[PDB]
Amino acid sequence: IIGGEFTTIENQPWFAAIYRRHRGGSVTYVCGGSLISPCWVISATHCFIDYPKKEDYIVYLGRSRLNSNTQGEMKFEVENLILHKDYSADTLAHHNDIALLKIRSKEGRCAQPSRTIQTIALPSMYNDPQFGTSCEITGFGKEQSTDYLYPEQLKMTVVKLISHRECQQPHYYGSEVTTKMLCAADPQWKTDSCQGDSGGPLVCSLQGRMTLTGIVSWGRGCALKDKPGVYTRVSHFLPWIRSHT
Numbered sequence: 001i002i003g004g005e006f007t008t009i010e011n012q013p014w015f016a017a018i019y020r021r022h023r024g025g026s027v028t029y030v031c032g033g034s035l036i037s038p039c040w041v042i043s044a045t046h047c048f049i050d051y052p053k054k055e056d057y058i059v060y061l062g063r064s065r066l067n068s069n070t071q072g073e074m075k076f077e078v079e080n081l082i083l084h085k086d087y088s089a090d091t092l093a094h095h096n097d098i099a100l101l102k103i104r105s106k107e108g109r110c111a112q113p114s115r116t117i118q119t120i121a122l123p124s125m126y127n128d129p130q131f132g133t134s135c136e137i138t139g140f141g142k143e144q145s146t147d148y149l150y151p152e153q154l155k156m157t158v159v160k161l162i163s164h165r166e167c168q169q170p171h172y173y174g175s176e177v178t179t180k181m182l183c184a185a186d187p188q189w190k191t192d193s194c195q196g197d198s199g200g201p202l203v204c205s206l207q208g209r210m211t212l213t214g215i216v217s218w219g220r221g222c223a224l225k226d227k228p229g230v231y232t233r234v235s236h237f238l239p240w241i242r243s244h245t
């Protein structure tokens with residue numbers, strides 16, 4: 001997250017932190033995700049497509065820091081790793097960038113909701129907020145495009161939804177943005193998602209409730225003029241989500 005503010009998991013208690021085990025024991029951060037039911041985390045396919053073996057991954061819930069244990073956190077194995085069969089990528093855009101992880105602890109349990117671990121509601125079908133709606137994004141991604149490190153503390157910021165007409169303008173993204181994507185950005189381009197925020201939630205207030213409207217997917221640079229963040233449009237994937245969960 002470029003800009004924004006530091007936060008703790010209580011503010012975004014559906015946020016999942018996904019890591020990968022390496023040959024030799026080291027563990028590195030991969031991507032974010034969102035808890036949509038006790039046994040299911042939703043994320044982005046591009047986070048896993050290089051290493052699509054579920055045994056490589058660890059999921060934490062209730063975690064506020066990248067490399068420190070947070071009181072109350074829970075740690076899971078990945079029982080199923082479900083990638084979207086119509087995924088594709090060009091030099092910039094990722095299509096159908098959505099993935100499901102079924103989580104299971106070493107003793108065979110799913111998530112126990114708590115003050116630091118909660119599910120996020122899915123949107124109603126083809127129902128998004130109007131353009132200009134403020135939504136929240138959350139993640140452990142880079143604080144500056146040029147940083148080599150990720151922040152140790154979770155961050156969140158606010159971006160505003162951009163109309164599809166505006167985002168497909170040539171000096172934005174053209175046809176790289178599809179109707180299964182949403183764009184969102186800051187009016188001054190000063191705050192944004194970045195590398196390492198992929199897979200995490202874009203949350204908006206819809207019908208009086210916080211709702212998972214988007215999944216961080218891609219963008220050209222970070223917090224660059226005329227280059228919004230692009231998000232998988234969750235309201236267009238409900239049959240896929242329901243069918244694989």
Ligand SMILES: N=C(N)NC(=O)c1nc(-c2cc3ccccc3o2)c(N)nc1N
Pocket residue numbers: 145192193194195196197198216217218219220221222223224227228229230
């Ligand atoms: N909201 C945005 N503008 N961008 C992103 O959401 C986003 N940006 C990157 C990214 C930007 C970048 C710049 C220089 C080098 C590597 C970079 O990697 C990434 N790896 N994933 C993402 N989801």
